[PDB]
C-alpha cells in the first residue's frame, strides 16, 4: 500500500500499513529499541533480573506509566497469549523465531523477524535497524546508533590510556568449574572502540585453562550482578591466584552495568560508557 513500509527478513517480507498502535516485544532485548524512539509496547517479554515489566532502569522514563502485559519464553514463543492480545505488529528478532512459528505469528499480525541467520542475539544495529524501519522512525533510530558510537569515541578520547590494553569479557558465575566468556565478535565492538585490545577467546575456559587464558589479559570485565556473585568467584582458588586478582585488575560489574552490557541496545548502552569507563580507569590509569 501506499504509505505502507516493507521490511526484509529471515523468513522474507513484512508489510506494515501504518505507524502501529499494539505493538508487541516477542523477544529478549526488543523492547529498548522501541522505548528508544517513543513507541509503549502492549507487551514486554522478560529475560532476566526480576525488573518490573521486565523493563531495566533505562528504560523506565520511557516507559513511564504503562502497564504492559509481560511475556516469557519459557515454553518458547506463547504465540495464543500473543494472539490475545490483538496486536498490529510483533517484534521478533531476538525471540528464537523459526519459519513455522514465523508463519504461525504472521497470521496474527505483521511480524518482524531477525535478519539473517541469528535467531538469538543477531548484531544491535541490525535488530534497531528493522525495528525502526517498521515503526515508522527510521530517522530517529539511525541519530540514536550514531549517538551510541559517539559516546565510544569520546570514551577513547577521554581515555588514551586504554589503548593498547587487554581486555576479557566473562561471565559473572562460574560454569562446571570453567568461566565463561564473550568471544570476539558484535558484542566486544564496544569495547574496540573504546581502544581496548579486544583477545581472542573461547565461550567457555575449561578450568585447566583458566590462568594460561586469564593471564594474558591487562583487565577482567566479570558480569556480576550480585556481591554474592563477586564473592563465589574471588572465593575460587583458581581465580584468587589470578593476577588479575593479584594487581587489583578485576572490575565486577554492578547488575545495572552487567545488564546495561547485556541488552546491548539504543538505551542501555549509554548507561555503559558511563559507568564502564570509570572502572576501567581505576584498574587500567
Given at each position: 500500500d501506499d504509505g505502507s513500509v516493507t521490511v526484509r527478513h529471515a523468513?522474507?517480507?513484512?508489510?506494515i500499513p501504518g505507524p502501529p498502535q499494539r505493538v508487541v516485544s516477542a523477544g529478549l532485548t526488543e523492547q529498548d529499541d522501541l522505548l528508544a524512539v517513543g513507541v509503549v509496547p502492549i507487551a514486554v517479554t522478560d529475560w532476566f533480573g526480576g525488573?518490573?515489566?521486565?523493563?531495566?532502569?533505562?528504560?523506565?522514563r520511557q516507559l513511564a506509566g504503562a502497564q504492559p502485559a509481560v511475556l516469557n519464553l519459557d515454553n518458547g514463543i506463547p504465540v495464543?497469549?500473543?494472539?490475545?492480545?490483538?496486536?498490529?505488529?510483533?517484534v521478533a528478532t531476538n525471540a528464537g523465531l523459526d519459519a513455522d512459528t514465523y508463519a504461525?505469528?504472521?497470521?496474527?499480525?505483521?511480524?518482524?523477524?531477525?535478519?539473517?541467520?541469528?535467531?538469538?542475539?543477531?548484531?544491535?544495529?541490525?535488530?534497531?535497524?528493522i525495528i525502526g524501519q517498521a515503526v515508522f522512525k527510521n530517522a530517529e533510530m539511525t541519530?540514536?546508533?550514531?549517538?551510541?558510537?559517539?559516546?565510544?569515541?569520546?570514551?577513547?578520547?577521554?581515555?588514551?590510556?586504554f589503548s593498547g590494553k587487554k581486555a576479557l569479557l566473562l561471565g559473572g558465575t562460574l560454569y562446571r568449574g570453567g568461566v565463561q566468556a564473550t568471544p570476539p565478535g558484535w558484542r566486544t565492538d564496544f569495547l574496540t572502540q573504546m581502544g581496548l585490545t579486544v583477545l581472542q577467546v573461547p565461550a567457555l575456559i575449561p578450568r585447566d585453562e583458566i590462568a594460561s587464558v586469564l593471564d594474558g589479559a591487562d583487565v577482567l570485565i566479570w558480569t556480576t550482578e550480585s556481591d554474592q556473585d563477586r564473592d563465589a568467584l574471588l572465593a575460587?582458588?583458581?581465580?584468587?591466584?589470578?593476577?588479575?586478582?593479584r594487581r587489583d585488575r578485576n572490575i565486577?560489574?554492578?547488575?545495572?552495568?552487567?545488564?546495561?552490557?547485556?541488552?546491548?541496545?539504543?538505551?542501555?548502552?549509554?548507561?555503559?560508557?558511563?559507568?564502564l569507563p570509570p572502572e576501567l580507569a581505576r584498574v587500567l590509569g
Open positions: 523468513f522474507g517480507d513484512t508489510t525488573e518490573p515489566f521486565g523493563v531495566w532502569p533505562w528504560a523506565q495464543e497469549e500473543i494472539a490475545a492480545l490483538k496486536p498490529d505488529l510483533i504461525k505469528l504472521s497470521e496474527i499480525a505483521p511480524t518482524v523477524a531477525q535478519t539473517g541467520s541469528e535467531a538469538f542475539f543477531e548484531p544491535w544495529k541490525d535488530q534497531a535497524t541519530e540514536l546508533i550514531k549517538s551510541v558510537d559517539d559516546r565510544f569515541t569520546t570514551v577513547k578520547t577521554d581515555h588514551p590510556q575460587d582458588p583458581i581465580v584468587a591466584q589470578l593476577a588479575a586478582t565486577f560489574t554492578t547488575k545495572e552495568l552487567a545488564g546495561a552490557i547485556a541488552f546491548a541496545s539504543p538505551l542501555s548502552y549509554p548507561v555503559v560508557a558511563d559507568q
